Amino acid sequence: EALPKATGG
Amino acid sequence: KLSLQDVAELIRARACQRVVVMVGAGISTPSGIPDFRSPGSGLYSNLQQYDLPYPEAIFELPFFFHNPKPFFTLAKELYPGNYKPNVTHYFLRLLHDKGLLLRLYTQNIDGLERVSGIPASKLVEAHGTFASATCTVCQRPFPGEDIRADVMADRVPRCPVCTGVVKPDIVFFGEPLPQRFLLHVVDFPMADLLLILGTSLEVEPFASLTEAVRSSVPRLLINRDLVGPLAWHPRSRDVAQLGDVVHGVESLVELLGWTEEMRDLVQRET
Ligand SMILES: *CCC[n+]1cc(CCCCCCCCCCCC)n([C@H]2O[C@H](COP(=O)(O)OP(=O)(O)OC[C@H]3O[C@@H](n4cnc5c(N)ncnc54)[C@H](O)[C@@H]3O)[C@@H](O)[C@H]2O)n1
Ligand SMILES: [Zn+2]
């Protein structure tokens, strides 16, 4: 849950 | 305002002893690798010949699951090149040799930070690596060389256990970042200088790290132009050296008095 996903924003 | 000379003097006085660095694809264009967003030469302006619905799709995880062939076609063009680190990479290694590098956060997947001699524990490859791969179905791991071998033979890498497509351990858009990205939680509040080199600060959450240093801490951008919060949310101790990244780094090296150490390092390594 603590790991974020890569986005264009 | 602070100047580049002010930053050099802060380092030389060892008022700054704990430098965090953020880099992107602009630090490897002097090595011959295109970036993504530069006009004319960036990757997104040169994907017309690939079988894509739109350019960005080639780096998106849902599209990869739909059709992985355009991605591997593009990878076949990076594998053969014998790219080498340039002066920017060696300057970051010199920071480590002087005991000043807290951590180097990179968006790049070219592996040149490791080639230039940055030790693994000082490096966060925030968007992953070609050095290893994972089956998209059964999650078994494989060395990156296996994928390279298949791709250069014009084959989609498939898992020997379950036949699922095997993907390099690069972070696509829509994919989770690696656990060691969370080192930023402790690294950035204690850094006493932030260096930002060769990135558009357009991809998240990597770009948000620029605001994680304290307001008292200088942020030095070496880049063709102002980008991100440095452009629209500037802070009083921001410094921008706008121009070519190699020229900016060489200027900083001269202000620091490090020309001899840089030459010695580059000679040893090349
Ligand atoms: C959430 C995850 C998003 N994500 C994942 C990835 C990687 C996808 C896989 C890539 C596979 C590449 C294969 C290449 C084959 C080549 C065959 C020959 N990414 C990637 O996209 C982001 C790009 O952002 P960036 O900041 O690193 O690069 P930009 O191009 O947007 O901006 C560059 C920046 O530098 C300046 N600049 C260029 N050259 C300069 C020189 N010489 N001097 C100074 N400044 C220079 C440009 O003006 C611009 O401002 C990354 O996150 C990357 O990982 N994203
Ligand atoms: Zn498998």
Author numbering:
A (entry chain B): -4 to 4
B (entry chain A): 122 to 391
Direct quotes from the study:
Sirtuins (SIRTs) are nicotinamide adenine dinucleotide (NAD+)‐dependent lysine deacylases linked to key physiological and disease processes. SIRTs catalyze lysine deacylation through a distinctive mechanism in which the amide oxygen of the acylated lysine transiently attacks the C1’ of the nicotinamide riboside residue from NAD+ (hereafter referred to as C1’ of NAD+ ribose), forming a covalent ADP‐ribosylated intermediate. These trapped adducts inhibit the enzyme without covalent protein modification, prompting us to term the compounds “Sirtuin Trapping Ligands” (SirTraps).
To determine isoform selectivity, all compounds were tested against SIRT1 and SIRT3, the closest SIRT2 homologs.
